[PDB]
Design a protein around this nucleic acid. Structure first.
Ligand SMILES: Nc1ccn([C@H]2C[C@H](O)[C@@H](COP(=O)(O)OP(=O)(O)OP(=O)(O)O)O2)c(=O)n1
Ligand code: NA
Ligand code: NA
Ligand SMILES: [Zn+2]
Ligand SMILES: [Zn+2]
Ligand SMILES: [Zn+2]
Length: 327
DNA sequence: CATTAGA
DNA sequence: TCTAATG
């Protein structure tokens, strides 16, 4: 957790690099399992040779570990770190819509900067266009102060559209959190469930609503069950206009809501742990449902769920209030 | 690990 | 269709 800290971080930086800058999935993959095991390795590593003994750790990684221990640094690491090429890639990827692939490509075109990015909006697609158009706000955190107004607004319109709807703003916001990155709204209607062959409009209605009253500014993407947009609190009585924010709206079939809700509320730690327990308790949890375990190694049979509570009950747990879903 | 764009 | 991107 800190006893092998440096080692693990160098290794991540290392891994990271193969994957984006170059394209060595392998190596990249190589670095992570290694950094994965050494992290667990409950003993302060004094040498490579020692590390080496680990699984995933081969000749190469050890070597690095040696120099890293020996001298407070790593050359290949210092070099990369400097190297404009790699730097440029890491950077471009910052724009919503820019992945490594494209990052790589732009660079080899000579698009190392945001300015360049501008001068070539032609080479960008819409996602990426919008991305650049809000690069700054994109990086900005969401003061919960803001999260509450936003939430407020969403709920009202949903409501007006159809009172049958069921929305939930999940995430960290849901778990107390002082800020959040983007808003995730969980969505399901009663007329939509596991069987009933879709209802696209079910989603499309509100997407339009919200958009109708200027909360929705732009559309990153829009499916029949998932919508990726850009919203924004109305700039009051002028002077303090609000930063553009990432929002994702999702249609879930009524019968698998709370699992989804449970799920989305996280935290990963509550998850895995909420997950580790359901197993002992004779089950299985997932992003959508919860099925009883059967001794033949496994089983199915998606249990009926009416609320976050139900699941707890199921795995006979203690209802943990969202605020305390922190682990 | 799933859903949407895109070319 | 595949391949990229966000989640
Ligand atoms: C997993 C964690 C959440 O359940 C969901 C993804 O949500 P985000 O990636 O938005 O993560 P958080 O809500 O935890 O972070 P943020 O502070 O960005 O909202 O899947
Ligand atoms: Na990006
Ligand atoms: Na392939
Ligand atoms: Zn020891
Ligand atoms: Zn989020
Ligand atoms: Zn999100």
């Amino acid at each position: 957790e800190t006893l092998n800290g440096g080692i693990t971080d160098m290794l991540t930086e290392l891994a990271n690099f193969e994957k984006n800058v170059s394209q060595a999935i392998h190596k990249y993959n190589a670095y992570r399992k290694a950094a994965s095991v050494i992290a667990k390795y409950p003993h302060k590593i004094k040498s490579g040779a020692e590390a080496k003994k680990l699984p995933g750790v081969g000749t190469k990684i050890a070597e690095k570990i040696d120099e890293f221990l020996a001298t407070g640094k790593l050359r290949k690491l210092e070099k990369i770190r400097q190297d404009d090429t790699s730097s440029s890639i890491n950077f471009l990827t910052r724009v919503s819509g820019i992945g490594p692939s494209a990052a790589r490509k732009f660079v080899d075109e000579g698009i190392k900067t945001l300015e360049d990015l501008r001068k070539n909006e032609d080479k960008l697609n819409h996602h990426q266009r919008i991305g650049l158009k809000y690069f700054g706000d994109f990086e900005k955190r969401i003061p919960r102060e803001e999260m509450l107004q936003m939430q407020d607004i969403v709920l009202n319109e949903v409501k007006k559209v159809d009172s049958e709807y069921i929305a939930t703003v999940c995430g960290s916001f849901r778990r107390g959190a002082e800020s959040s990155g983007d808003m995730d709204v969980l969505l399901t209607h009663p007329s939509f469930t596991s069987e009933s062959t879709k209802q696209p409009k079910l989603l499309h209605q509100v997407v339009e609503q919200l958009q109708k009253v200027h909360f929705i500014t732009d559309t990153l993407s829009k499916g029949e069950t998932k919508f990726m947009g850009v919203c924004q609190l109305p700039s009051k009585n002028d002077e303090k206009e609000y930063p553009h924010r990432r929002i994702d709206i999702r249609l879930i079939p009524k019968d698998q809501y709370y699992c989804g809700v449970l799920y989305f509320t996280g935290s990963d730690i509550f998850n895995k742990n909420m997950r580790a327990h359901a197993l002992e308790k004779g089950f299985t949890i997932n992003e959508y449902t919860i099925r009883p375990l059967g001794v033949t190694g496994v089983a199915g049979e998606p249990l009926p769920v009416d609320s976050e509570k139900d699941i707890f009950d199921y795995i006979q747990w203690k209802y943990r209030e969202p605020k305390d879903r922190s682990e």
